[PDB]
Amino acid sequence: MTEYKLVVVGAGGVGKSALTIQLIQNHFVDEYDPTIEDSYRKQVVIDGETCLLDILDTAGDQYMRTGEGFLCVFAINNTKSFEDIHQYREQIKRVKDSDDVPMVLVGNKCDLAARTVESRQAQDLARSYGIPYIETSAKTRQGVEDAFYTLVREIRQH
Ligand SMILES: Nc1nc2c(ncn2[C@@H]2O[C@H](COP(=O)(O)OP(=O)(O)NP(=O)(O)O)[C@@H](O)[C@H]2O)c(=O)[nH]1
Ligand SMILES: [Ca+2]
Ligand SMILES: [Mg+2]
Ligand SMILES: [Mg+2]
Numbered sequence: 039m040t041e042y043k044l045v046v047v048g049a050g051g052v053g054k055s056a057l058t059i060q061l062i063q064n065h066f067v068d069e070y071d072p073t074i075e076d077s078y079r080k081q082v083v084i085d086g087e088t089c090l091l092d093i094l095d096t097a098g099d100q101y102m103r104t105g106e107g108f109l110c111v112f113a114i115n116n117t118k119s120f121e122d123i124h125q126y127r128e129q130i131k132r133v134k135d136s137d138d139v140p141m142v143l144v145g146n147k148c149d150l151a152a153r154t155v156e157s158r159q160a161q162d163l164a165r166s167y168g169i170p171y172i173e174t175s176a177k178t179r180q181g182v183e184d185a186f187y188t189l190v191r192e193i194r195q196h
Pocket of ligand 4: 154
């Protein structure tokens with residue numbers, strides 16, 4: 039079957055681990071245990087295709103080198119995390135030595151009310167990169183499968 043190597047990156051505390059764990063294990067991690075480097079693997083059917091997903095959960099270059107697609111995550115209630123997305127874009131360019139890498143911009147914690155990053159603002163950034171913008175909530179599961187599955191579909195268009 040086809041294996042897809044996905045990598046989740048972004049500032050500390052934006053919800054990278056919670057997103058990955060919600061997708062793979064179907065539960066919300068409420069506590070905040072900073073990640074060093076973890077990996078998850080699971081078989082799922084996407085668009086009729088049985089897929090093996092290998093997901094690298096990073097801390098907010100070597101281990102990311104094999105990544106085929108990246109989720110660049112920021113939190114909608116953390117303006118600085120949005121402003122620093124370029125740092126992760128730069129790292130991905132360095133590790134893959136390419137300006138054409140499958141990616142999805144993710145605005146997480148959309149269930150929270152203290153929003154400082156408006157959807158339109160993120161849409162404009164995603165448009166400049168030529169990638170989709172999807173909002174998610176690791177807490178309610180909103181958009182979680184959509185974000186990861188869309189990344190797979192982006193890798194397919196590659
Ligand atoms: N309300 C809400 N809280 C969230 C959401 N995603 C994550 N959190 C909370 O935010 C905190 C940090 O989440 P975590 O997944 O550990 O973030 P991280 O990006 O993986 N951190 P690190 O880079 O240090 O590894 C946790 O207390 C977690 O419950 C979300 O969608 N909604
Ligand atoms: Ca703990
Ligand atoms: Mg983490
Ligand atoms: Mg503003």
